[PDB]
């Protein structure tokens, strides 16, 4: 853990293979959504042929990851406490398996929903789970893997858009499957949100460690 020299943030970082399984899966999704009749209808609710791939190709270059605690080398609030935790120290470099339950896209971000296990939640902080919809959403609902971003969109947006998506998905206001994609059921949630509920949970290998950049 380097009890002294802290990273920019902790989190689960996907291996080279899992990273492309998810990365390429997220591309074909954006390729299907952009060519799907449902999405084409409500396009004015989302903005030529708007190729979603290029639209979401602004993510900061780097390895796909599910962040836990942003530390800023200890300058971020709570960083020192999180790193000094025994579970965090005893998990550095340990490999975990992250479950991807669904893909999603909004006018701002395009990400993947992560369903953390009981032990993975031991590393989930208790500050990154109380924005606006986290009240009534369970702990760890913000867990995600950012796959894409619009022009001026910070990756932190992806977690909030997920909570926005889940807040409606819980309220039964997602509606009915507007279509069945090869991977799962497409759902139109209005206000630009979309979800590909994966019929089969995508399993991705990931290592919990710190990133210094």
């Amino acid at each position: 853990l380097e009890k002294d020299f802290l990273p920019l943030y902790f989190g689960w970082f996907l291996t080279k293979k899992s990273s492309e399984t998810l990365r390429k899966a997220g591309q074909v999704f954006l390729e299907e959504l952009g060519n799907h009749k449902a999405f084409k209808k409500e396009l004015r609710h989302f903005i030529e042929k708007l190729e979603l791939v290029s639209y979401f190709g602004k993510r900061p270059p780097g390895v796909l990851h599910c962040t836990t605690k942003f530390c800023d080398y200890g300058k971020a609030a709570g960083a020192e406490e999180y790193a000094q935790q025994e579970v965090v120290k005893r998990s550095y470099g340990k490999a975990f398996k992250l479950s991807i339950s669904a893909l999603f896209v909004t006018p701002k971000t395009a990400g993947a929903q992560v369903v953390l296990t009981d032990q993975e939640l031991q590393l989930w902080p208790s500050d990154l789970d109380k924005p606006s919809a986290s009240e009534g959403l369970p702990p760890g609902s913000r867990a995600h893997v950012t796959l894409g971003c619009a022009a001026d969109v910070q990756p932190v947006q992806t977690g909030l858009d997920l909570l926005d998506i889940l807040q409606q998905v819980k309220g039964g206001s997602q509606g009915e499957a507007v279509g069945e994609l090869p991977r799962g059921k497409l759902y139109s949630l209005g206000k630009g949100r979309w979800m590909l509920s994966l019929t089969k949970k995508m399993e991705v290998k990931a290592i919990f460690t710190g990133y210094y950049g």
Partner: nanobody
Framework: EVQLEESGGGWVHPGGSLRLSCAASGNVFGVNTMAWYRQAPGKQREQRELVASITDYGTTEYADSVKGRFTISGDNAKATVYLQMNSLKPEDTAVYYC??????????????????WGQGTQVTVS
């Protein structure tokens, strides 16, 4: 401890094509960016100009001088990049160096982003 290894390059008459590749050997955890710079005959290395770039996401940036003639490819899984050059001009003569912003895992499992350079590949157009 990664090593960048170029390939391709040669002597071509104006209007030909070569495919410059560049793999990465070692303990690379992931690729963040892959690019191709070039240094013309005479230049000093301080004047290495960007020729083509590619991101993990697949976003490409090119130089107008080559945009439409060259085409950068990629493969994050094998840490390999390609630069298929088309309709080559004499002004394209240079040594094409391979750049790679990569994430690498230290022994303590920590992750860092490193910038690696390649030795070079000779490209001649005449």
């Amino acid at each position: 401890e990664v090593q960048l290894e170029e390939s391709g390059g040669g002597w071509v008459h104006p209007g030909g094509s070569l495919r410059l590749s560049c793999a990465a050997s070692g303990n690379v955890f992931g690729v963040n960016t892959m690019a191709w710079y070039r240094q013309a005959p005479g230049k000093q290395r301080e004047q290495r100009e960007l020729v083509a770039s590619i991101t993990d996401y697949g976003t490409t940036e090119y130089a107008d001088s080559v945009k439409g003639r060259f085409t950068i490819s990629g493969d994050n899984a094998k840490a390999t990049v390609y630069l298929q050059m088309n309709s080559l001009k004499p002004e394209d003569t240079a040594v094409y160096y391979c750049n790679m912003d990569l994430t690498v895992m230290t022994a303590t499992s920590s992750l860092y982003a490193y910038d690696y350079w390649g030795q070079g590949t000779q490209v001649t157009v005449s």
